[PDB]
From a paper:
Here, we describe [name] serial crystallography experiments and [name] experiments using batch-grown microcrystals of the enzyme [name] ([name]). [name] is a proline isomerase enzyme that is highly abundant in human cells, and plays important biological roles as both a protein folding chaperone and modulator of intracellular signaling pathways. Conformational heterogeneity of a key network of residues in [name] that extends from the core of the protein to the active site has been studied previously using ambient-temperature crystallographic experiments. Rotameric exchange of residues in this network, which includes R55 (the catalytic residue), M61, S99, and F113, is required for enzymatic turnover.
The first injector system we implemented, in an experiment conducted at the MFX endstation of the [name] at the Linac Coherent Light Source (LCLS), is referred to as the microfluidic electrokinetic sample holder ([name]). This device relies upon the principle of electrospinning to break the surface tension of the crystal slurry and drive it into a microjet as it exits the tip of a capillary. Within the [name] system, gentle pressure from a syringe pump drives crystals through a capillary (250 μm i.d.) toward the X-ray interaction point, and application of approximately 3000 V of electrostatic potential (**[Table tbl1]**) across the sample stretches the liquid into a thin jet as it emerges from the capillary tip. We found that for the [name] data set, crystals do not appear to have an orientation bias as they are delivered to the X-ray beam, while the data set collected using LCP as a carrier medium for a viscous extrusion injector showed significant orientation bias. In the case of our [name] crystals, the dihedral space group symmetry prevents the crystals from having a dipole moment that could cause them to assume a preferred orientation in the electric field introduced by the [name] injector. Crystals measured using the [name] device (electrospinning) tended to have longer a, b, and c axes than crystals measured using viscous carrier media, which might result from dehydration of the crystals by the viscogens (LCP or cellulose), which reduce the relative humidity of the crystallization mother liquor. Furthermore, [name]’s structure did not appear to be significantly perturbed by either the electric field within the [name] jet, or by the high pressures within the LCP injector used for the LCP and Cellulose datasets (**[Fig fig3]**). The conformation of this loop is stabilized by a key charged residue (R69), which may be perturbed by the electric field.
Author numbering: 2 to 164
Write the structure that this text describes.
């Protein structure tokens, strides 16, 4: 079946709670595997200790830049970038997990958790999972965002792995 991965979220080092994601390996196996492996760290690098650098309430939470912590870095398990696998799945509402990118076929490690329906991203960003448990924790994280995306406290992935 599809893998489930968890993030344990901290706010300025204090524990907030746990989010778990279902990864749609049955429909986007290469994209799901990248996120899974970065969550376990099994390749020697990944998300543990990294931050959510951009949070816009009513839009999305963005993270995954574990090399420069500000949206300019990250890398995939396949190299610096990899292709758009397919666009079968759509941005249907809160909880959707989708890849950030900088143009066609530029996926790395950055991702965003949607907190609203974002249909204008359909066909441009690859959807590859959804929040399974802990959407309330995503809602709590949202409250530390701002209109321009800067967070008022440091939101980090204190631990992560596969359930």
């Amino acid at each position: 079946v599809n893998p489930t991965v968890f993030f344990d979220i901290a706010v300025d080092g204090e524990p907030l709670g746990r989010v778990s994601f279902e990864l749609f390996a049955d429909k986007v196996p290469k994209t799901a595997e990248n996120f899974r492996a970065l969550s376990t760290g099994e390749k020697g690098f990944g998300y543990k200790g990294s931050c959510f650098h951009r949070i816009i309430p009513g839009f999305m939470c963005q993270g995954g830049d574990f090399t420069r912590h500000n949206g300019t870095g990250g890398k995939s398990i396949y190299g610096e970038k990899f292709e758009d696998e397919n666009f079968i799945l759509k941005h249907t509402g809160p909880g959707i997990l989708s890849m950030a990118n900088a143009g066609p076929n530029t996926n790395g490690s950055q991702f965003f958790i949607c907190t609203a329906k974002t249909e204008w991203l359909d066909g441009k960003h690859v959807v590859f999972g959804k929040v399974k448990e802990g959407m309330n924790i995503v809602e709590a994280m949202e409250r530390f965002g701002s209109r321009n995306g800067k967070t008022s406290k440091k939101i980090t992935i204190a631990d992560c792995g596969q359930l």
